Design an enzyme around this catalytic site. Structure first.
Site, PDB file in Angstrom:
ATOM      1  N   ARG A 162      -2.508  -5.090   9.256  1.00 10.05           N
ATOM      2  CA  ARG A 162      -1.132  -4.616   9.185  1.00 10.05           C
ATOM      3  C   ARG A 162      -0.723  -3.953  10.493  1.00 10.05           C
ATOM      4  O   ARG A 162      -1.443  -3.092  11.010  1.00 10.05           O
ATOM      5  CB  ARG A 162      -0.935  -3.641   8.022  1.00 10.05           C
ATOM      6  CG  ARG A 162       0.509  -3.186   7.891  1.00 10.05           C
ATOM      7  CD  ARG A 162       0.763  -2.305   6.684  1.00 10.05           C
ATOM      8  NE  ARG A 162       2.008  -2.697   6.037  1.00 10.05           N
ATOM      9  CZ  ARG A 162       2.794  -1.878   5.352  1.00 10.05           C
ATOM     10  NH1 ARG A 162       2.511  -0.598   5.221  1.00 10.05           N
ATOM     11  NH2 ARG A 162       3.912  -2.354   4.810  1.00 10.05           N
ATOM     12  N   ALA A 182      -0.509   0.358  11.664  1.00 12.14           N
ATOM     13  CA  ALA A 182       0.943   0.420  11.717  1.00 12.14           C
ATOM     14  C   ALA A 182       1.413   1.870  11.621  1.00 12.14           C
ATOM     15  O   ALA A 182       0.616   2.803  11.468  1.00 12.14           O
ATOM     16  CB  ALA A 182       1.563  -0.427  10.598  1.00 12.14           C
ATOM     17  N   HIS A 183       2.733   2.044  11.734  1.00 15.17           N
ATOM     18  CA  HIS A 183       3.423   3.297  11.416  1.00 15.17           C
ATOM     19  C   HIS A 183       2.950   4.462  12.282  1.00 15.17           C
ATOM     20  O   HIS A 183       3.019   5.623  11.869  1.00 15.17           O
ATOM     21  CB  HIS A 183       3.295   3.644   9.930  1.00 15.17           C
ATOM     22  CG  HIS A 183       3.763   2.556   9.015  1.00 15.17           C
ATOM     23  ND1 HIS A 183       3.292   2.409   7.729  1.00 15.17           N
ATOM     24  CD2 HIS A 183       4.653   1.553   9.207  1.00 15.17           C
ATOM     25  CE1 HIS A 183       3.875   1.368   7.163  1.00 15.17           C
ATOM     26  NE2 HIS A 183       4.704   0.829   8.039  1.00 15.17           N
ATOM     27  N   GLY A 189       7.451  -1.764  -2.046  1.00 14.42           N
ATOM     28  CA  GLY A 189       6.962  -0.406  -2.163  1.00 14.42           C
ATOM     29  C   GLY A 189       7.676   0.418  -3.216  1.00 14.42           C
ATOM     30  O   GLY A 189       7.198   0.533  -4.348  1.00 14.42           O
ATOM     31  N   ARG A 190       8.834   0.983  -2.853  1.00 14.57           N
ATOM     32  CA  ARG A 190       9.495   1.962  -3.715  1.00 14.57           C
ATOM     33  C   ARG A 190       9.875   1.370  -5.070  1.00 14.57           C
ATOM     34  O   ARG A 190       9.776   2.054  -6.097  1.00 14.57           O
ATOM     35  CB  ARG A 190      10.723   2.536  -3.008  1.00 14.57           C
ATOM     36  CG  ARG A 190      10.386   3.641  -2.018  1.00 14.57           C
ATOM     37  CD  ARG A 190      11.563   3.989  -1.129  1.00 14.57           C
ATOM     38  NE  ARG A 190      11.904   2.899  -0.225  1.00 14.57           N
ATOM     39  CZ  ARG A 190      12.916   2.929   0.632  1.00 14.57           C
ATOM     40  NH1 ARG A 190      13.715   3.980   0.721  1.00 14.57           N
ATOM     41  NH2 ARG A 190      13.127   1.880   1.422  1.00 14.57           N
ATOM     42  N   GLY A 249      -3.513   3.905   1.279  1.00  8.32           N
ATOM     43  CA  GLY A 249      -4.395   4.100   2.414  1.00  8.32           C
ATOM     44  C   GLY A 249      -5.619   4.901   2.023  1.00  8.32           C
ATOM     45  O   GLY A 249      -5.499   5.906   1.316  1.00  8.32           O
ATOM     46  N   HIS A 252      -5.025  -0.794   8.420  1.00  5.92           N
ATOM     47  CA  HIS A 252      -3.757  -0.101   8.642  1.00  5.92           C
ATOM     48  C   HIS A 252      -3.639   0.195  10.133  1.00  5.92           C
ATOM     49  O   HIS A 252      -4.140   1.202  10.633  1.00  5.92           O
ATOM     50  CB  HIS A 252      -3.679   1.167   7.798  1.00  5.92           C
ATOM     51  CG  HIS A 252      -2.321   1.804   7.770  1.00  5.92           C
ATOM     52  ND1 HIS A 252      -1.337   1.511   8.691  1.00  5.92           N
ATOM     53  CD2 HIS A 252      -1.781   2.715   6.923  1.00  5.92           C
ATOM     54  CE1 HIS A 252      -0.255   2.217   8.416  1.00  5.92           C
ATOM     55  NE2 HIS A 252      -0.497   2.954   7.347  1.00  5.92           N
ATOM     56  N   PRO A 269       0.841  -1.205   0.000  1.00  7.10           N
ATOM     57  CA  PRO A 269       0.000   0.000   0.000  1.00  7.10           C
ATOM     58  C   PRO A 269       0.871   1.247   0.000  1.00  7.10           C
ATOM     59  O   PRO A 269       1.809   1.362   0.789  1.00  7.10           O
ATOM     60  CB  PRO A 269      -0.804  -0.128   1.298  1.00  7.10           C
ATOM     61  CG  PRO A 269       0.058  -0.987   2.189  1.00  7.10           C
ATOM     62  CD  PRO A 269       0.725  -1.966   1.259  1.00  7.10           C
ATOM     63  N   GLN A 289      -6.879  -0.653   1.490  1.00  4.74           N
ATOM     64  CA  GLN A 289      -6.372  -0.421   2.866  1.00  4.74           C
ATOM     65  C   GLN A 289      -7.181   0.694   3.532  1.00  4.74           C
ATOM     66  O   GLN A 289      -7.232   1.801   2.979  1.00  4.74           O
ATOM     67  CB  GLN A 289      -4.888  -0.072   2.911  1.00  4.74           C
ATOM     68  CG  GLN A 289      -4.317  -0.071   4.321  1.00  4.74           C
ATOM     69  CD  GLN A 289      -2.958   0.581   4.403  1.00  4.74           C
ATOM     70  OE1 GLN A 289      -2.765   1.716   3.956  1.00  4.74           O
ATOM     71  NE2 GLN A 289      -2.004  -0.135   4.974  1.00  4.74           N
ATOM     72  N   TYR A 305      -0.045   5.407  13.340  1.00  3.28           N
ATOM     73  CA  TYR A 305      -1.312   6.063  13.053  1.00  3.28           C
ATOM     74  C   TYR A 305      -2.335   5.647  14.115  1.00  3.28           C
ATOM     75  O   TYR A 305      -1.962   5.126  15.168  1.00  3.28           O
ATOM     76  CB  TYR A 305      -1.717   5.767  11.607  1.00  3.28           C
ATOM     77  CG  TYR A 305      -0.795   6.460  10.630  1.00  3.28           C
ATOM     78  CD1 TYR A 305      -0.792   7.846  10.523  1.00  3.28           C
ATOM     79  CD2 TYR A 305       0.095   5.741   9.842  1.00  3.28           C
ATOM     80  CE1 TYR A 305       0.051   8.493   9.646  1.00  3.28           C
ATOM     81  CE2 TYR A 305       0.946   6.382   8.959  1.00  3.28           C
ATOM     82  CZ  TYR A 305       0.920   7.757   8.866  1.00  3.28           C
ATOM     83  OH  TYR A 305       1.763   8.409   7.994  1.00  3.28           O
TER      84      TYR A 305
END
Ligand SMILES: Cc1cc2nc3c(=O)[nH]c(=O)nc-3n(C[C@H](O)[C@H](O)[C@H](O)COP(=O)(O)O)c2cc1C
Ligand SMILES: Cc1cc2nc3c(=O)[nH]c(=O)nc-3n(C[C@H](O)[C@H](O)[C@H](O)COP(=O)(O)O)c2cc1C
EC number: 1.3.1.42
Lengths: 376, 374
Positions: free
Chosen positions: B227, B177-178, B332-333, B54, B175, B21, B96, B180
């Site tokens: 996730r 994760a990260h 991802g990238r 997202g 989501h 995502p 997501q 949030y």
């Protein structure tokens, strides 16, 4: 390129502002400086450049890494002298960093398997690891809290090691008071839980570093003494509730020492925290390091003398720091491991070899130590 | 081994390369655009698994610009067109569900309200938010929501999950994760609550449990992925014991599967990649082995499909699947700059370099779908 405008650090006429940061490399087998150290520092020495050695033991109890050099015996002094001679032959200035790890040690590094000494009985938590002589990772044990008399003996170990460094021919010494080691264990209020005259208030917590600096200054002169601290780095559980307040209190003591001694120190050396950006996250590359920049500039403005900045500096950041007046000198660590001619590469904006962390602390006199190539 | 088939529930996947995502900010005015269609189409493959950027679950859930939503029937209609195209290529697509929590600003808050979160503590100023005009702004002070408001946010996840299914998505990903909104309850470096959602490890996992259970009760466990990132240094999201928190979440998910009688679609875990304290003497000692143990400890604990993500290469992805570290690997990238990344990985072909300057721009072509094929 402001990194190559000359700088007057006391009596030393430096030809550029790129400094070799102190870096433990663990090639001084059985705490004796080896010939490999001479070849390593010679590779990195430049005419008019300033070097700072790896942290050096001040006593049999000061080590928490394997095969780190000492300067508390006359045998170590004789071997250091050969290294200083080859560095001076290339026209470089070199200081010896005096290092006591305090509670960041292990029984395997202590005489008679004794406990490491500290300001507190609190150990470093299990979120940190120590490097063991066999290459594995160990657990930091519970330290022993030292009293006033023993504190004055540790201070005396700094003074004799400072004198020994001058006997070896070093241009000066640097006090390692950073990164959660012994001096930082008295400074940080997340570690120093003492109730005597060395704990509690900012003044009491700064007493130990004042006593160390004053002793070496009284022994070899303020001009030959640098001081390194890191108030905003919590390495090895070394956090303070107000890092800027702590840093400013330390700077005030140094200014007062200089005033009473009638002479300025060689420099104040500060390592800053440097949070790497996460390219794999949504906002990792969006953040700014401006609050850390303001803290470093505040300490610089508060201190009356030469300021060396360190921690995550690149060629571009080093140019920017000097150009904006944020620092007089910039010290480089990891890039200087992998680039013996780092000063020339920065002068030319040349590509830089990548450091190999696997060989940062191994014992080989060549591999990962002196076999990093020069520019072709 | 990245191209040995894997059965993820009812889906017979032909390879292990997953589109992670990724917010790209091309859904102008929070409405998915035709550009998203081309983007995902270019990267969809027969039997390949894709996860969308997202997607907002409510008008207050965004913290980036031009991010898509799924809380309006207009959004639902445009999403349907994208899903159809991806399905036409023979790909599975999950949407997501994203709530940024305190990681919002205010040019994204409808009533100029304060971002909702578990706490009143804001993100420190060393992190910045991307502003609609392309500059970087400061995160404001969030509002700590009470017990009753928590049930309304859970309902927003439930309604958005139903909307994604109406759009034709094969499932949704939570989501959490990260750092949030969901992670703001999980991490004890953020959650300083004193009610039944804070304090103990079990209380911090209550919010993610309720969210997962609500969407499972609405669309079925087989259409729900989750996730998490217990060991991520994003937006001041630290936990004192990442391993304990991860295992507690896994225990809750395993129990949800047992009571629901069906397994979840997958567990999706972001990987730390510890680069902190690299300038210190002992900061990096035992930092790659503990991260390796953490990812494998969670994988062994979770009863179902495990997806790893973050900085994975062709070589690293092969090693993870070959050694049993994961069932699927999301990229991802490299998937930004390589529309045919699956084909390029199959052939071990050179990979285009991603251009970070165009990660979050609004152009429907430049830096988005103009990356060339092999
Ligand atoms: C392998 C290694 C050993 C180090 N040893 C010491 C040391 O003995 N004493 C000290 O004060 N700092 C030490 N440091 C920290 C550096 O002196 C310096 O602050 C840091 O490397 C600067 O960050 P940079 O590598 O990005 O240039 C060490 C750093 C590394 C990577
Ligand atoms: C530009 C960009 C946007 C991202 N957006 C999201 C997102 O919206 N939701 C999410 O869960 N992860 C997001 N991620 C993280 C990725 O899903 C994934 O964890 C990571 O990109 C994989 O690392 P790699 O790019 O090196 O392969 C994003 C990553 C990048 C680089």
């Amino acid at each position: 390129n402001p990194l190559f405008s000359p700088y007057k650090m006391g009596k030393f006429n430096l030809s550029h502002r790129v400094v070799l940061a102190p870096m433990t490399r663990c090639r001084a087998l059985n705490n004796i400086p080896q010939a490999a150290l001479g070849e390593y520092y010679e590779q990195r020495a430049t005419a008019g450049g300033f070097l700072i050695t790896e942290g050096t033991m001040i006593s049999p109890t000061s080590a928490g890494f394997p095969h780190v050099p000492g300067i508390f015996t006359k045998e170590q002094v004789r071997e250091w002298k050969k290294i200083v001679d080859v560095v001076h032959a290339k026209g470089a200035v070199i200081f010896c960093q005096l290092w006591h790890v305090g509670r960041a040690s292990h029984e395997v590094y202590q005489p008679a398997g004794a406990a490491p000494i500290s300001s507190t009985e609190k150990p470093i938590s299990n979120r940190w690891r120590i490097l063991m002589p066999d290459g594995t990772h160990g657990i930091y044990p519970k330290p022993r809290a030292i009293g006033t008399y023993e504190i004055s003996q540790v201070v005396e170990d700094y003074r004799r090691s400072a004198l020994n460094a001058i006997e070896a021919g070093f241009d000066g010494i640097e006090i390692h008071g950073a990164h959660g080691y012994l001096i930082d264990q008295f400074l940080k209020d997340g570690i120093n839980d003492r109730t005597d005259e060395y704990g509690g208030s900012l003044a009491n917590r700064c007493k130990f570093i004042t006593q160390v600096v004053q002793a070496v200054v009284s022994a070899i002169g303020a001009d030959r003494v640098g001081v390194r601290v890191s108030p905003a780095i919590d390495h090895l559980d070394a956090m303070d509730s107000n890092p800027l307040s702590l840093g400013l209190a330390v700077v005030e003591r140094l200014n007062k020492i200089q005033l009473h001694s009638g002479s300025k120190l060689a420099y104040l050396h500060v390592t800053q925290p440097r949070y790497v950006a996460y390219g794999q996250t949504e906002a990792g590359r969006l953040g700014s390091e401006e609050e850390e920049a303001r803290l470093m500039r505040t300490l610089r403005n508060a201190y009356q003398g030469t300021f060396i900045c360190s921690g995550g500096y690149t060629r571009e950041l080093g140019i920017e720091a000097v150009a904006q007046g944020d620092a007089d000198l910039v010290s480089y660590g990891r890039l200087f491991i992998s680039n013996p001619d780092l000063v020339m590469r920065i002068k030319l904006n040349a590509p830089l070899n990548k450091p190999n962390r696997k060989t940062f602390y191994t014992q080989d006199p060549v591999v990962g130590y002196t076999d990093y190539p020069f520019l072709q």
